[PDB]
Amino acid sequence: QIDRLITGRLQSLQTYVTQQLIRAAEIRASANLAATKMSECVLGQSKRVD
Amino acid sequence: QIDRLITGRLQSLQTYVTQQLIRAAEIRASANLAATKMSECVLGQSKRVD
Amino acid sequence: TKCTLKSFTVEKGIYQTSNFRVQPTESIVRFPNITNLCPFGEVFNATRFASVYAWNRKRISNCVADYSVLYNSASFSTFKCYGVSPTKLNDLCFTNVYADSFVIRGDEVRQIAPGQTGTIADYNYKLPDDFTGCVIAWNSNNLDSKVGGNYNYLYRLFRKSNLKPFERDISTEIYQAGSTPCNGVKGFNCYFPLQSYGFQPTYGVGYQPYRVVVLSFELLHAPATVCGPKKSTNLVKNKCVNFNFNGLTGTGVLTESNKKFLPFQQFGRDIADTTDAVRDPQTLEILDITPCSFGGVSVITPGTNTSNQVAVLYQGVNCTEVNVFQTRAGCLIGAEHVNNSYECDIPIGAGICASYQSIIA
Amino acid sequence: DSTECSNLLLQYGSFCTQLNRALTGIAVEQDKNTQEVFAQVKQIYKTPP
Amino acid sequence: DSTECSNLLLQYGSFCTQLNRALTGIAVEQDKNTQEVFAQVKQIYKTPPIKDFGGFNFSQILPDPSKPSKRSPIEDLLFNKVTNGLTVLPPLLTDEMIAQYTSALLAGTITSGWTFGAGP
Amino acid sequence: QCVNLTTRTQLPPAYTNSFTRGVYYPDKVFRSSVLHSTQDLFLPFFSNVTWFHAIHKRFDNPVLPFNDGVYFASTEKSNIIRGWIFGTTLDSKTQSLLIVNNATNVVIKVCEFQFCNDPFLGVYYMESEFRVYSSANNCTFEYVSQPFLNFKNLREFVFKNIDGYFKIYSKHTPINLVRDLPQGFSALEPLVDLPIGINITRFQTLLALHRSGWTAGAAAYYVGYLQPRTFLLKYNENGTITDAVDCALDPLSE
Ligand SMILES: *[C@@H]1O[C@H](CO)[C@@H](O[C@@H]2O[C@H](CO)[C@@H](O)[C@H](O)[C@H]2NC(C)=O)[C@H](O)[C@H]1NC(C)=O
Ligand SMILES: *[C@@H]1O[C@H](CO)[C@@H](O[C@@H]2O[C@H](CO)[C@@H](O)[C@H](O)[C@H]2NC(C)=O)[C@H](O)[C@H]1NC(C)=O
Ligand SMILES: *[C@@H]1O[C@H](CO)[C@@H](O)[C@H](O)[C@H]1NC(C)=O
Ligand SMILES: *[C@@H]1O[C@H](CO)[C@@H](O)[C@H](O)[C@H]1NC(C)=O
Ligand SMILES: *[C@@H]1O[C@H](CO)[C@@H](O)[C@H](O)[C@H]1NC(C)=O
Ligand SMILES: *[C@@H]1O[C@H](CO)[C@@H](O)[C@H](O)[C@H]1NC(C)=O
Ligand SMILES: *[C@@H]1O[C@H](CO)[C@@H](O)[C@H](O)[C@H]1NC(C)=O
Ligand SMILES: *[C@@H]1O[C@H](CO)[C@@H](O)[C@H](O)[C@H]1NC(C)=O
Ligand SMILES: *[C@@H]1O[C@H](CO)[C@@H](O)[C@H](O)[C@H]1NC(C)=O
């Protein structure tokens, strides 16, 4: 019975950690974009359109 | 017993391949950034701040 | 490649299709020296055997027992097991062995059996209904019998109640055949329970004395000290063989090792907890276990619209272990190596590329 | 807090260490993201009164 | 090498094919990444033998002819400072050819400006 | 034959520090230049080990609970400590294990012994006094082996009762310290595994008298207790354990 509960909860936790890793990659990409905007729009004047 | 070992090792291998894919996405993003820096900082003079 | 890609047309490129294996050729089982043998020579071939009311019990433990010599002996007229198999005695392990030795009559040899009712079974030597082990019996007319009659071998004839299994009774209490009071004084209906046998050389088969040794096995939670013999084979090195060293099994290439073990250590592990070093139990030498040369089989081809010529890449495999060319990626068979440099068409790896113009690398 | 559950969970190996390591990497990555975005100056400038 | 294990593993279908294909995609993606980063020029440029650049010194970044690896002193220091069915595929570009690509990029940006990145 | 020793001087037992002693090899596996974390019955670092003396008038031979294992440290000169007493009730009702080293050999017996209340050996100034038992009724295991043996010698022992296996780990160390345990590292090699299969809950050291009444030769020994914990063991290039980390001692080693 604990073997069934352990494999179910471990699969749930692995799914949660995988989704958190994908969302953390997306937020890291957004934060790299935000740091680029902080460097190029605030600390200087950008010729890049839009 | 072999079925238990098979599903455990298959779960381990799926976990390894999933985290390798996430790290491959991160390394691909870093390499795209490195190719952008190669094009814009080495092959030319960049007006982009920082 | 068509089988792997599930298509009848193959685009130009390199395709990993299979997995080259160095197949294991031999099986090498090395087991340590068969010493400290069990003293079966002083039980089966002792000087004087005991009587059946006072059967001698020898405890066989902390030794290795060779039952094949006992089983292959043709002198034994009866070899009957009731809980095990005679051909699996050399494979099984037991905690201890009880050896019960006695002499009986030739007609009473069948009476040492589970479920058998007789005078020897009820009053002299009783076996349980769930008995495990083997009963061994052989004729001893040339040794035990005397021309004046061997009266030294006694047997119990009378008792009030039947025996429990593995129970001895050396008491000499006078039996009461009737209901008359006997205070140890013999009378008309009070007889001594132990009578002597009539072993003489003129009797035929059935009255001759038979020496019986009964081996009983115990399978308690104590460790199994009594085990069968181990038949170790010769050791073969520098080949991808299946090794079995003292219960540690695997597949590998067994080469000589420069690792100096400490004398208490037997196996060797790397960082990743894989057995890469081992000690042979027969001769105390250290062997490295290199894994066999597994590799990936990749097929380098142009399009099937262009040509049907292919090349095979065995990844991480030396060319002496499989138009043959050695690369750092592996052994490439079917491509002619050239000294000219072109652009990369089909990537092989480590700076090697393949192209079609025949297939060149 | 079940010790029998943890004894059975130790049979599965280092899955829990892997998940804790991944979550720790995400947790320090968020602070790295904030550090990269907002801490682009080492001088705290002040406006005139 | 257990055949009973593989017979039971065939009941799960094409999981192994998906894992191998994902790892193959990662492996070719690494070579594609190196190709996109370093192979941005199709002409292998060299510096002139006389290093007269108006007082500018590039010896720490140009390749050292005395070293067999043909690396720069900085690149040599960088390479010194970095220390069961498993196989490691070698990269398609060796370290010597990546060093050759960086040498070509350095020679282009020293001798020709940004003109080599936009044309001849 | 038994003799009450009635000339003892009353003194409470001592305690001292274990330092980094009591480490043994957990398995028969060679390891080269690697760090191995293992979960087994280990002796805690810097723990409170019980210290017993034999000096003249001190003669410390009590019976102590075995618990899950015993670390025995011996600062020994002139061979006073000769063996140990192993059992549960230490009488003829149960079955007991005897380890003795007399003047010739070491004898290992698993039998039903009647232990004396004060068991000892004796050397006359020549060993001619054996008073450790009064009877031996039902033996199941006998094993005769090679001898194991200012304080000049240091003897470390680990005794474990796991699944009917009796593991003896040992290490001989040449020391020159007078009174207490020296501070250092020495991993105990596995010497011999014994198929005893018996219950053991209590133990007692065996000493030797010096006769010229009786006189106690100068000796001191140390008892430590094995607890289930984790060690991080360091294996050098030659494959010997040179250092260890107790994972539950302090947060730094954690
Ligand atoms: C360019 O820089 C290099 C390195 O800084 C100079 O080489 C040094 O030259 C001096 C004098 O000849 C030597 O004492 C050093 O040992 C040299 N260093 C190395 C690393 O070789 C070089 O002189 C500079 N100028 C030119 C024109 O190359
Ligand atoms: C040494 O002292 C012990 C402790 O008093 C003695 O053991 C007791 O002996 C008496 C003798 O009548 C018994 O009644 C007790 O039951 C014993 N104690 C226990 C715990 O069993 C021992 O006999 C003494 N030795 C000698 C040789 O007399
Ligand atoms: C007597 O029996 C023992 C049983 O182990 C056997 O080894 C020995 O060879 C026998 N003796 C003879 C003379 O056959
Ligand atoms: C074991 O048997 C081999 C057989 O040749 C022998 O050489 C060796 O001395 C024996 N003893 C040990 C301890 O290996
Ligand atoms: C060891 O235990 C004794 C009593 O059991 C105690 O008095 C002593 O302080 C302890 N030692 C340490 C270092 O705690
Ligand atoms: C061993 O002995 C102790 C006390 O003598 C007892 O509590 C315990 O139950 C015994 N164990 C077994 C397995 O008999
Ligand atoms: C040592 O003990 C053994 C076994 O009890 C015995 O045979 C031997 O004689 C003893 N040695 C001496 C010197 O008494
Ligand atoms: C143990 O010894 C006693 C007395 O010596 C004896 O009566 C009893 O039968 C023995 N038990 C076993 C199992 O040997
Ligand atoms: C290992 O053994 C060699 C002798 O072969 C010795 O020189 C070296 O110092 C040893 N290493 C250690 C750490 O003891």
PDB file of N, CA and C in Angstrom, chain C residues 152-198:
ATOM      1  N   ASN C 152      27.192 -58.866  20.175  1.00  0.00           N
ATOM      2  CA  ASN C 152      27.455 -57.542  20.731  1.00  0.00           C
ATOM      3  C   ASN C 152      26.399 -56.524  20.312  1.00  0.00           C
ATOM      4  N   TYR C 153      25.735 -56.744  19.179  1.00  0.00           N
ATOM      5  CA  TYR C 153      24.730 -55.814  18.671  1.00  0.00           C
ATOM      6  C   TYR C 153      23.379 -56.145  19.294  1.00  0.00           C
ATOM      7  N   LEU C 154      22.925 -55.298  20.213  1.00  0.00           N
ATOM      8  CA  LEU C 154      21.646 -55.470  20.884  1.00  0.00           C
ATOM      9  C   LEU C 154      20.567 -54.626  20.213  1.00  0.00           C
ATOM     10  N   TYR C 155      19.312 -54.966  20.503  1.00  0.00           N
ATOM     11  CA  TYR C 155      18.179 -54.189  20.020  1.00  0.00           C
ATOM     12  C   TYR C 155      17.033 -54.296  21.017  1.00  0.00           C
ATOM     13  N   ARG C 156      16.263 -53.215  21.132  1.00  0.00           N
ATOM     14  CA  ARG C 156      15.135 -53.181  22.055  1.00  0.00           C
ATOM     15  C   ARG C 156      13.947 -53.924  21.458  1.00  0.00           C
ATOM     16  N   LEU C 157      13.355 -54.823  22.244  1.00  0.00           N
ATOM     17  CA  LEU C 157      12.223 -55.616  21.786  1.00  0.00           C
ATOM     18  C   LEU C 157      10.891 -55.190  22.383  1.00  0.00           C
ATOM     19  N   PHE C 158      10.881 -54.663  23.607  1.00  0.00           N
ATOM     20  CA  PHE C 158       9.644 -54.331  24.301  1.00  0.00           C
ATOM     21  C   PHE C 158       9.723 -52.938  24.910  1.00  0.00           C
ATOM     22  N   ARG C 159       8.647 -52.169  24.748  1.00  0.00           N
ATOM     23  CA  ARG C 159       8.451 -50.927  25.485  1.00  0.00           C
ATOM     24  C   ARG C 159       6.950 -50.671  25.572  1.00  0.00           C
ATOM     25  N   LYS C 160       6.538 -49.972  26.638  1.00  0.00           N
ATOM     26  CA  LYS C 160       5.128 -49.652  26.852  1.00  0.00           C
ATOM     27  C   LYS C 160       4.574 -48.746  25.756  1.00  0.00           C
ATOM     28  N   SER C 161       5.343 -47.743  25.338  1.00  0.00           N
ATOM     29  CA  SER C 161       4.870 -46.750  24.386  1.00  0.00           C
ATOM     30  C   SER C 161       5.854 -46.618  23.231  1.00  0.00           C
ATOM     31  N   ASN C 162       5.342 -46.125  22.105  1.00  0.00           N
ATOM     32  CA  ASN C 162       6.160 -45.930  20.920  1.00  0.00           C
ATOM     33  C   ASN C 162       7.084 -44.725  21.086  1.00  0.00           C
ATOM     34  N   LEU C 163       8.128 -44.696  20.263  1.00  0.00           N
ATOM     35  CA  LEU C 163       9.120 -43.632  20.315  1.00  0.00           C
ATOM     36  C   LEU C 163       8.601 -42.339  19.702  1.00  0.00           C
ATOM     37  N   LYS C 164       9.054 -41.224  20.269  1.00  0.00           N
ATOM     38  CA  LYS C 164       9.053 -39.965  19.554  1.00  0.00           C
ATOM     39  C   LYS C 164      10.183 -39.980  18.524  1.00  0.00           C
ATOM     40  N   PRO C 165      10.080 -39.169  17.464  1.00  0.00           N
ATOM     41  CA  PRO C 165      11.174 -39.097  16.483  1.00  0.00           C
ATOM     42  C   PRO C 165      12.469 -38.564  17.085  1.00  0.00           C
ATOM     43  N   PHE C 166      13.582 -39.203  16.691  1.00  0.00           N
ATOM     44  CA  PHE C 166      14.941 -38.904  17.163  1.00  0.00           C
ATOM     45  C   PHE C 166      15.052 -38.973  18.688  1.00  0.00           C
ATOM     46  N   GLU C 167      14.519 -40.051  19.259  1.00  0.00           N
ATOM     47  CA  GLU C 167      14.568 -40.297  20.694  1.00  0.00           C
ATOM     48  C   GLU C 167      15.376 -41.558  20.968  1.00  0.00           C
ATOM     49  N   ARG C 168      16.308 -41.466  21.913  1.00  0.00           N
ATOM     50  CA  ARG C 168      17.096 -42.603  22.363  1.00  0.00           C
ATOM     51  C   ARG C 168      16.513 -43.167  23.654  1.00  0.00           C
ATOM     52  N   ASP C 169      16.745 -44.464  23.876  1.00  0.00           N
ATOM     53  CA  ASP C 169      16.327 -45.115  25.118  1.00  0.00           C
ATOM     54  C   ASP C 169      17.333 -46.217  25.443  1.00  0.00           C
ATOM     55  N   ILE C 170      18.302 -45.902  26.302  1.00  0.00           N
ATOM     56  CA  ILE C 170      19.301 -46.873  26.729  1.00  0.00           C
ATOM     57  C   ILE C 170      18.942 -47.502  28.071  1.00  0.00           C
ATOM     58  N   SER C 171      17.718 -47.289  28.549  1.00  0.00           N
ATOM     59  CA  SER C 171      17.294 -47.844  29.826  1.00  0.00           C
ATOM     60  C   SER C 171      17.074 -49.350  29.725  1.00  0.00           C
ATOM     61  N   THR C 172      17.362 -50.043  30.826  1.00  0.00           N
ATOM     62  CA  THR C 172      17.258 -51.496  30.910  1.00  0.00           C
ATOM     63  C   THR C 172      16.178 -51.923  31.900  1.00  0.00           C
ATOM     64  N   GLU C 173      15.037 -51.236  31.879  1.00  0.00           N
ATOM     65  CA  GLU C 173      13.935 -51.587  32.763  1.00  0.00           C
ATOM     66  C   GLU C 173      13.257 -52.868  32.287  1.00  0.00           C
ATOM     67  N   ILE C 174      12.947 -53.750  33.237  1.00  0.00           N
ATOM     68  CA  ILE C 174      12.326 -55.033  32.922  1.00  0.00           C
ATOM     69  C   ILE C 174      10.883 -54.796  32.493  1.00  0.00           C
ATOM     70  N   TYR C 175      10.531 -55.289  31.308  1.00  0.00           N
ATOM     71  CA  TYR C 175       9.188 -55.100  30.781  1.00  0.00           C
ATOM     72  C   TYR C 175       8.183 -55.985  31.511  1.00  0.00           C
ATOM     73  N   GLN C 176       6.947 -55.496  31.602  1.00  0.00           N
ATOM     74  CA  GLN C 176       5.837 -56.248  32.180  1.00  0.00           C
ATOM     75  C   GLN C 176       4.963 -56.736  31.030  1.00  0.00           C
ATOM     76  N   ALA C 177       5.115 -58.011  30.667  1.00  0.00           N
ATOM     77  CA  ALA C 177       4.283 -58.580  29.611  1.00  0.00           C
ATOM     78  C   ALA C 177       2.846 -58.765  30.079  1.00  0.00           C
ATOM     79  N   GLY C 178       2.664 -59.204  31.315  1.00  0.00           N
ATOM     80  CA  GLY C 178       1.367 -59.351  31.936  1.00  0.00           C
ATOM     81  C   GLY C 178       1.063 -58.224  32.898  1.00  0.00           C
ATOM     82  N   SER C 179       0.228 -58.522  33.891  1.00  0.00           N
ATOM     83  CA  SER C 179      -0.145 -57.557  34.916  1.00  0.00           C
ATOM     84  C   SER C 179       0.436 -57.904  36.279  1.00  0.00           C
ATOM     85  N   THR C 180       1.335 -58.884  36.344  1.00  0.00           N
ATOM     86  CA  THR C 180       1.949 -59.254  37.607  1.00  0.00           C
ATOM     87  C   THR C 180       2.978 -58.201  38.023  1.00  0.00           C
ATOM     88  N   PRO C 181       3.116 -57.948  39.326  1.00  0.00           N
ATOM     89  CA  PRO C 181       4.111 -56.966  39.785  1.00  0.00           C
ATOM     90  C   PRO C 181       5.529 -57.493  39.614  1.00  0.00           C
ATOM     91  N   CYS C 182       6.367 -56.702  38.947  1.00  0.00           N
ATOM     92  CA  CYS C 182       7.787 -57.001  38.808  1.00  0.00           C
ATOM     93  C   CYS C 182       8.581 -55.801  39.298  1.00  0.00           C
ATOM     94  N   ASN C 183       9.461 -56.027  40.271  1.00  0.00           N
ATOM     95  CA  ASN C 183      10.293 -54.977  40.858  1.00  0.00           C
ATOM     96  C   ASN C 183      11.702 -54.989  40.283  1.00  0.00           C
ATOM     97  N   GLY C 184      11.830 -55.265  38.987  1.00  0.00           N
ATOM     98  CA  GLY C 184      13.109 -55.562  38.384  1.00  0.00           C
ATOM     99  C   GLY C 184      13.521 -57.014  38.475  1.00  0.00           C
ATOM    100  N   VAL C 185      12.674 -57.872  39.034  1.00  0.00           N
ATOM    101  CA  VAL C 185      12.951 -59.297  39.169  1.00  0.00           C
ATOM    102  C   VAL C 185      12.289 -60.010  37.998  1.00  0.00           C
ATOM    103  N   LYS C 186      13.078 -60.771  37.245  1.00  0.00           N
ATOM    104  CA  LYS C 186      12.548 -61.522  36.118  1.00  0.00           C
ATOM    105  C   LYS C 186      11.689 -62.685  36.602  1.00  0.00           C
ATOM    106  N   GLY C 187      10.648 -62.985  35.840  1.00  0.00           N
ATOM    107  CA  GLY C 187       9.714 -64.042  36.188  1.00  0.00           C
ATOM    108  C   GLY C 187       9.185 -64.742  34.957  1.00  0.00           C
ATOM    109  N   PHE C 188       7.971 -65.290  35.077  1.00  0.00           N
ATOM    110  CA  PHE C 188       7.352 -65.977  33.949  1.00  0.00           C
ATOM    111  C   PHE C 188       6.905 -65.012  32.858  1.00  0.00           C
ATOM    112  N   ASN C 189       6.479 -63.806  33.227  1.00  0.00           N
ATOM    113  CA  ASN C 189       5.974 -62.832  32.265  1.00  0.00           C
ATOM    114  C   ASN C 189       6.695 -61.499  32.407  1.00  0.00           C
ATOM    115  N   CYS C 190       8.000 -61.543  32.668  1.00  0.00           N
ATOM    116  CA  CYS C 190       8.815 -60.336  32.755  1.00  0.00           C
ATOM    117  C   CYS C 190      10.175 -60.641  32.150  1.00  0.00           C
ATOM    118  N   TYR C 191      10.499 -59.971  31.045  1.00  0.00           N
ATOM    119  CA  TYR C 191      11.685 -60.279  30.261  1.00  0.00           C
ATOM    120  C   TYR C 191      12.531 -59.027  30.076  1.00  0.00           C
ATOM    121  N   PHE C 192      13.818 -59.248  29.845  1.00  0.00           N
ATOM    122  CA  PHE C 192      14.738 -58.148  29.585  1.00  0.00           C
ATOM    123  C   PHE C 192      14.474 -57.591  28.189  1.00  0.00           C
ATOM    124  N   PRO C 193      14.412 -56.266  28.020  1.00  0.00           N
ATOM    125  CA  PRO C 193      13.980 -55.717  26.724  1.00  0.00           C
ATOM    126  C   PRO C 193      15.028 -55.818  25.627  1.00  0.00           C
ATOM    127  N   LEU C 194      16.315 -55.776  25.967  1.00  0.00           N
ATOM    128  CA  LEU C 194      17.380 -55.773  24.973  1.00  0.00           C
ATOM    129  C   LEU C 194      17.819 -57.206  24.695  1.00  0.00           C
ATOM    130  N   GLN C 195      17.649 -57.644  23.451  1.00  0.00           N
ATOM    131  CA  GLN C 195      18.085 -58.960  23.014  1.00  0.00           C
ATOM    132  C   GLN C 195      19.219 -58.816  22.009  1.00  0.00           C
ATOM    133  N   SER C 196      20.062 -59.841  21.935  1.00  0.00           N
ATOM    134  CA  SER C 196      21.202 -59.822  21.032  1.00  0.00           C
ATOM    135  C   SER C 196      20.828 -60.452  19.697  1.00  0.00           C
ATOM    136  N   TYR C 197      21.420 -59.930  18.628  1.00  0.00           N
ATOM    137  CA  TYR C 197      21.177 -60.482  17.306  1.00  0.00           C
ATOM    138  C   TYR C 197      21.930 -61.797  17.114  1.00  0.00           C
ATOM    139  N   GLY C 198      21.530 -62.527  16.077  1.00  0.00           N
ATOM    140  CA  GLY C 198      22.126 -63.805  15.741  1.00  0.00           C
ATOM    141  C   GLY C 198      22.948 -63.777  14.468  1.00  0.00           C
TER     142      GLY C 198
END
